[PDB]
Amino acid sequence: GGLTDEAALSCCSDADPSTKDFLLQQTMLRVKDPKKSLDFYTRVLGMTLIQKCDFPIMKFSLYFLAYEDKNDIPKEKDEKIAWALSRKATLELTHNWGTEDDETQSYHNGNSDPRGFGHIGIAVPDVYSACKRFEELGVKFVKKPDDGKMKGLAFIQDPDGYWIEILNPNKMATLM
Amino acid sequence: GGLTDEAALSCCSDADPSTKDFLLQQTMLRVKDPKKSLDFYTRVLGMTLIQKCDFPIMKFSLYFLAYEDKNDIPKEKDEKIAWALSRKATLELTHNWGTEDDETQSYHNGNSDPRGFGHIGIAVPDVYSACKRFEELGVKFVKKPDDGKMKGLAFIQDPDGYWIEILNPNKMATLM
Ligand SMILES: N[C@@H](CCC(=O)N[C@@H](CSCc1ccccc1)C(=O)NCC(=O)O)C(=O)O
Ligand SMILES: N[C@@H](CCC(=O)N[C@@H](CSCc1ccccc1)C(=O)NCC(=O)O)C(=O)O
Ligand SMILES: [Zn+2]
Ligand SMILES: [Zn+2]
C-alpha cells in the first residue's frame, strides 16, 4: 500500500506565485490550565510567551509561545501584535475560561479514538541529554529514547496530555 | 476568569541554557488520502513536499510539507533527511496505509466533542485576495473573511476536515 515517490510527486504542484509569502504561523491547542501550560512550555521546553490576548465577551484567552528571544519582542502594543503574528512556528494555546475548575473536563490529545492530530515535535541537539533533564524535571514520557524499535527518538506529554516528539535531525537518517 | 498579564508572566520562566537550540519542527496530522492532501497543500496552499518516508513493516508513510524553496532540498538522501528534519514550521502528514479505501474511516479535526487540537494557521499578505483564489479553487470554508464578528480572518478546511486559519499579521491589531 502507500504511494510510490513518483505517485506522490505527480500529486504535487508548483507553488502558485500568489502564495509566495505565506508562512506556517501557528498550531492551536486548547489547554485546561494556562498556569500549568505556561510553566511547562517556558520552564521545561524553553519557549517564550510572546503575546497574550483576552476576549472577555467570548470568555477565552490566547497565549502565543515561540522559540524567540525575549529581547526581540516589540515594546509597542500594535507593533508587538504584528511581530508575534508574523513569527513562524508558534504555538497558540487557547484557554477557555473555567476549564481549570471543572474536575471532569479535559481535552483529547488525538491519539486515542477518535484520532486526528498526533503531536508537535521539537528538534533538539541531543535527545539523550534533553531527556535526562526532562526526567529530572518530572516530565511524563510516552516513549523514552531507547524504548521500542526506534532508539534515539522520544515522546513526552505536556500538562494536557498532548504528545511532543523529541528528535535530533542529525541522527534521524541513522535509525531510518 | 482568565489570568491577568502579571499572573501569566509569574508562571513563565526564562529559558534554561540547555534548551538554547531547540526549535518547533513539526505538527503531525493524520491524513486519510495522501493524494488529496498532497494536492491541497501544494497546489492550493503553496507548500513544498520536502521529504517522504515509508515504513512498510508498520504500514505507514510520512509526508513532510513546508514553505521551503524546492531548490534548497539537498540531493543526497541522508543529507536531505537532516535538512528536512531541521526546518522549522513543517507539517508531518501521517498516512496509515489503507484508510483511503475504508469508506467508513475518517479522522477527527478536534473541533467537535471530544475537542483538543484546533487548527494550524497560515499568515498571508492579503486575506481577501487569498480567499478569493481559495473560492475559485473550490476550497471549503468554515468562515469567510467577513462572516461573523471578526472580519478579515478566515478558516478553511483541508481534505480531512482540519481547520486552517488564514490571517494577515499586519491587520490583526485592527480587529483586536
Ligand atoms: N471557545 C473557542 C475559543 C477560541 C476561538 O473561538 N477562536 C476563534 C478565533 S480567535 C481570533 C484571533 C485569531 C488570531 C489572533 C487574534 C485573534 C475561532 O477559532 N473561531 C472559529 C469560527 O469563527 O468559526 C474554542 O475553544 O475553540
Ligand atoms: N499508526 C501510527 C503511524 C505513525 C507512527 O507510528 N509514528 C511513530 C513515530 S514515526 C518515526 C519517525 C519520526 C520522525 C522522522 C522519521 C521517523 C510514533 O508516533 N510512535 C509513537 C510511539 O512510539 O509510542 C499513527 O497513526 O500514529
Ligand atoms: Zn489560531
Ligand atoms: Zn512526528
UniProtKB/Swiss-Prot annotation, chains A, B:
A GO biological-process term: carbohydrate metabolic process
Covalent S-S links between cysteines: C11-C12, C53-C131
Q: What is the lineage of its organism?
A: Eukaryota, Metazoa, Chordata, Craniata, Vertebrata
Which residues does this entry mark as bearing S-glutathionyl cysteine?
A: C131
| Classification via SUPFAM superfamilies | Glyoxalase/Bleomycin resistance protein/Dihydroxybiphenyl dioxygenase
Mutagenesis or variant effect for T90A:
No effect on phosphorylation
This enzyme catalyses: (R)-S-lactoylglutathione = methylglyoxal + glutathione
Instruction: Explain how, and how many, cofactor molecules are bound.
Output: Binds 1 zinc ion per subunit. In the homodimer, two zinc ions are bound between subunits.
Annotated protein name in UniProt: Lactoylglutathione lyase
Positions where N6-succinyllysine occurs in the chain:
K80, K140
Changing C131A has the effect of: Impaired NO-mediated modification. Loss of NO-mediated modification
Q: How is it modified after translation?
A: Glutathionylation at Cys-131 inhibits enzyme activity. Phosphorylated at Thr-99 in the presence of CaMK2. However, this is a consensus site for phosphorylation by CK2 so phosphorylation may be mediated by CK2 rather than CaMK2. Phosphorylation is induced by TNF and suppresses the TNF-induced transcriptional activity of NF-kappa-B.
> Quick one: which residues bind Zn(2+)?
Q26, E92, H119, E165
List the source organism: Homo sapiens (Human)
Q: What does this protein do?
A: Catalyzes the conversion of hemimercaptal, formed from methylglyoxal and glutathione, to S-lactoylglutathione. Involved in the regulation of TNF-induced transcriptional activity of NF-kappa-B. Required for normal osteoclastogenesis.
The gene coding this protein: GLO1
Q: Which family is this protein grouped under?
A: Belongs to the glyoxalase I family.
Q: Per the UniProt record, which EC number(s) apply here?
A: 4.4.1.5
